[PDB]
Symmetry: C2
């Protein structure tokens, strides 16, 4: 129902923001390999978020 859809959409949103924050932290730590993997992870998180918005965004 609406509650479950909203929770899922909200999780997809904070996951996307957390990948960006983590990428920023990894870059600050000069953790280059991890930053690279995290940057791709942010692409994937964006893809999931858009997909969730399409179904649950009302």
């Amino acid at each position: 129902g609406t509650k479950q859809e909203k929770t899922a959409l909200n999780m997809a949103r904070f996951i996307r923001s957390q990948t960006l924050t983590l990428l920023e932290k990894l870059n600050e730590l000069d953790a280059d390999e991890q930053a690279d993997i995290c940057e791709s992870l942010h692409d994937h998180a964006d893809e999931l978020y858009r997909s969730c918005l399409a179904r649950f965004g009302d």
Copy 2:
């Protein structure tokens, strides 16, 4: 350092949360989204293991 541990904890959290969300999408029968989420969780697992080797202990 505490900053490295912050990064590590965040990587672990993204792995845990993409797992939870995968299961919730499965419960919604939201298959297109679940497929994307499972791949996202694969990559979150990868990032975590890389960060753990670098920053852990």
